[PDB]
Nucleic acid binder design. Structure first.
Lengths: 312, 312
DNA sequence: TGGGAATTCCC
DNA sequence: TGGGAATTCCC
């Protein structure tokens, strides 16, 4: 049966949600495989054609049951947190370049959410899926839906009250929904919507871009127990660790860990630790390895810093 | 003639304003001489007598034109950010040993201020002074109040906007005003206002308590210029210096400053610098000194740390 | 408490 | 497609 598929997925880490105050984002949500040598943006295609359609993107949460998020996708074909673009006659590939994510404050959550659920329900933007398991019975587009009843508005309120409590403002997903032409003109054949993978705010303490900016000693004697002051960018004391390693590739490469306690991490921007023992014992010659910060929650890592062990 | 006279001034530095979210300050705004277990708090006296008296404590603006501040003094005998005390029948010297300072949010500064001007007009608590000359008349012959009129609300809402733009949310000053009696229970024979000293918020980035936490190298060569990694509590890169000094007799003997630029202060919690040389090199025997941080602005400092220069 | 960190804003 | 700090809030 005809369908919607994501070609270019959105990249999970590295992009920052912006608050209204910050100004626009410089670029937009990037694609999973982007890099400076050659950048990229999220992309989807409607398989099995099924007539020139329209595609809507929306921000949903990262939970057991995907509901509406209170942050908003901002961009050219975007309005009220919902983006809407058309699938031209011949080309069924839709790309999403310059997509910003707008970050709401905890104050304006319930507020924004209630409106999103209101507009979703009247505009047929998947009310049973995202809003409440029992509502706005049916989808479609601009022909077969309109003004709400008290019971509904009421259901919409209890939903926003609860869901405001269970929303993470650090993680977000993209939901794409396509509409094939019903009757004549009126797009309304909604193909099953598909949710992208999680996108985490790089300004979130646990999804931050890890970095070693400078360390007092960049070489140490084989053994290790030499105290080193390392200055980094914001890290979480009970989740960070210093990883010394040697990329021998063909086999089990080397790996050791700087020694310290959570109390040694000074105000999130520095760690005073003690070097670990090189290749168990050692004698060698000056053996080069790398140092890096790594999060034990998600094993995400910082750019490497070259270290150098020297015999005794 | 009768005079209001601040005996004991407030603790000008070291007190933390608390958001309504945070509760009490445990103690009470202490005075300029409050030593642990020898507690002394702000004090005033009305000289030349006046009889039973009433005294209001209201928070005002540290600025080229003292106005009503947006924050609020909270405590017993304190209501709506205005405290009132009945200068005893014979005593005449009053003290407030439990004043707390409630920090408003940059968001709620207009509403709170506007209301403060309103309740200050409808009660004669220095309107033509704190608010706008135009509302000086406010006291007239009202039975302990007023019912605001035409421009007598407009100019208020007006002033609240221009003043909210001015406001420094880190500093406050107290204004004590004594109220003398007459025919019937009046207590409306004012006395010129007395404004205490500037009270700076401890949680203010530029009034916090300076402190050296750990050091890279605690001793050096008399021919300083050696690099140290210093972990400190919050400082500001453009207003910080590190001083190496020592005990001696009369006369400016030794005082040296660490070598670095603002770019070397790392995320406000660490500084990377070069040590200064002694007033020599040509000496024998290690000479102990002290290192201390200090704000270039006001010259506030931290508890010093030992340093030892070596010969060869 | 107040020592610290999460959240928001500013160029 | 940053860099760096100031503001509130927790417990």
């Amino acid at each position: 049966g005809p369908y919607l598929q994501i070609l270019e997925q959105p990249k999970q880490r590295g992009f920052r949600f912006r608050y209204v105050c910050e100004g626009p984002s410089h670029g937009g949500l990037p694609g999973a495989s982007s890099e400076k040598n050659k950048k990229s943006y999220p992309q989807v295609k409607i398989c099995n054609y099924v007539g020139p359609a329209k595609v809507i993107v929306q921000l949903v949460t990262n939970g057991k049951n995907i509901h509406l998020h209170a942050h908003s996708l901002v961009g050219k074909h975007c309005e009220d947190g919902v983006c809407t673009v058309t699938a031209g006659p011949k080309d069924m590939v839709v790309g999403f370049a310059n997509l910003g994510i707008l970050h709401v404050t905890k104050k304006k959550v319930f507020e924004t959410l209630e409106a999103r659920m209101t507009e979703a329900c009247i505009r047929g933007y998947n009310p049973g899926l995202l809003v409440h398991s029992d509502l706005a019975y049916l989808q479609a587009e601009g022909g077969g839906d309109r003004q709400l009843t008290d019971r509904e508005k009421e259901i919409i309120r209890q939903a926003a009250v609860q869901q405001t409590k269970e929303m993470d403002l650090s993680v977000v997903r993209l939901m794409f929904t396509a509409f094939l032409p019903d009757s004549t003109g009126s797009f309304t054949r909604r193909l099953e919507p598909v949710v992208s993978d999680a996108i985490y705010d790089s300004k979130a303490p646990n999804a931050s871009n890890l970095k070693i900016v400078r360390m007092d000693r960049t070489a140490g004697c084989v053994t290790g127990g030499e105290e080193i002051y390392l200055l980094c960018d914001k890290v979480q004391k009970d989740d960070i660790q210093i990883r010394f390693y040697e990329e021998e590739e063909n086999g089990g490469v080397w790996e050791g860990f700087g020694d310290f306690s959570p109390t040694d991490v000074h105000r999130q921007f520095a760690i005073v630790f003690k070097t670990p023992k090189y290749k168990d014992v050692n004698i060698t010659k000056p053996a080069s390895v790398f140092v890096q910060l790594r999060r034990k929650s998600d094993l995400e890592t910082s750019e490497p810093k070259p270290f150098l062990y020297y015999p005794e």
